[PDB]
Amino acid sequence: PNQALLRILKETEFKKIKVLGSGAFGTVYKGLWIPEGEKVKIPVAIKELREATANKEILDEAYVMASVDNPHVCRLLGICLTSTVQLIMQLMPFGCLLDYVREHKDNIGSQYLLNWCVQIAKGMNYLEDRRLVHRDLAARNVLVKTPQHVKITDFGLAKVPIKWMALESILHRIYTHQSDVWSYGVTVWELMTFGSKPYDGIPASEISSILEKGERLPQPPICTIDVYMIMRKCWMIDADSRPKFRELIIEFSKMARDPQRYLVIQ
Ligand SMILES: *CCC(=O)Nc1cc(-c2c[nH]c3ncnc(Nc4ccc(OCc5ccccn5)c(Cl)c4)c23)ccc1OCCCO
């Protein structure tokens, strides 16, 4: 492992200043990274995982998270191991993409939406090239660095997100790059509906019977048949029939050149 890519941070080297959010997983803080022997204060997010009841295996996974080098995947900048695991990475000031599209739905055009689809596919393709499976891709796990630069987060963990999972993950706990492609399709559906909840009101335990019957998320009103057919291909039962992320980059890149042709907005 290339240890230099991962900073092991002392408690004095970072400060939690404000709360970004909390859940069963833990708490994320906005803060500053103040490296010793430097004259800089770096805006960061600090995620403190819930205390659990060892260090060598954690660092091994952290080394992998620090080794990711792609503009559309968040990189682990540093770690602090105490009673808890604290993860430090660059602050993404605009927050998660799901909240972003909900807050800006009136003001989001077709080029923005298609560009995000390209960027998310590029990040996922990078993870696949690294033989890394995400297992939790969703619009809530894409962060907005600036409005046209998004990055995937929450990879490397090593409420189950049933509504984003491929059928084989629900039924057999099989997770592959092709099940990530299923989740990518749901994520695109979230963006194209401006943050709607997938299968809203349906209990998680009912989702597999919906998929088994051939029912799928509906075509978003702004989506032409061309865009929706890509999404539906992501939800085929046969995982090897779903698109590859490499193919998704190409297709959405083509559509981003003529966005008005493929999304009908306003
Ligand atoms: C969509 C709702 C949402 O996610 N709300 C948010 C947003 C943030 C947030 C805002 N700006 C930010 N900049 C940088 N990071 C974060 N969050 C964040 C995410 C993951 C992190 O780590 C990665 C990781 C890897 C493996 C396993 C688990 N995590 C880190 Cl260090 C930071 C961010 C923050 C919180 C938040 O809501 C939290 C409650 C709902 O989850």
Cα torsion 102, 103, 108, 113 to 10°: value is -40
Distance CA 87, CA 186 (A): 27
Tell me which of 20, 33, 136, 150 to substitute to probe ligand 1's pocket, judged by most ligand atoms within 8 Å of the beta carbon: 20
Ligand 1 contact via 99 beta carbon (within 6 Å): yes
Distance CA 102, CA 193 (A): 9
Q: The tokens of 109 are what?
A: 């055009």
The angstrom resolution of this structure is 1.7
Dihedral of alpha carbons 177, 149, 100, 193, sign: negative
Residue carrying structure tokens 């080394």: 63
Ligand 1 contact via 150 beta carbon (within 6 Å): no
Superfamily of domain 95-261: Transferase(Phosphotransferase) domain 1 (1.10.510.10)
Q: The tokens of 13 are what?
A: 């080297």
Domain boundaries, the chain: 3-90, 95-261
- Per the entry, the structure determination technique was X-ray
CB distance 111 to 122 below 8 Å: no
Distance CA 261, CA 232 (A): 19
The residues, ordered by sequence, that sit 6+ positions from 88 with a Cβ below 8 Å of its Cβ are 7, 9, 14, 33, 44, 45, 46, 76, 77, 78, 79, 80
- How many Å is the maximal CA-CA distance in the chain? 61
Residue carrying structure tokens 């003529």: 258
In sequence order, the β-bridge partners of residue 28 are: 21, 47
Q: Which of 99, 136, 154, 238 is catalytic?
A: 136
Cα torsion 219, 198, 208, 156 to 10°: value is 120
Ligand 1 contact via 161 beta carbon (within 6 Å): no
Ligand 1 contact via 23 beta carbon (within 6 Å): yes
- Specify whether domain 3-90 bears CATH 3.30.200.20: yes
Beta pairing, strands 78-81 & 85-90 = antiparallel
Q: The tokens of 1 are what?
A: 């492992």
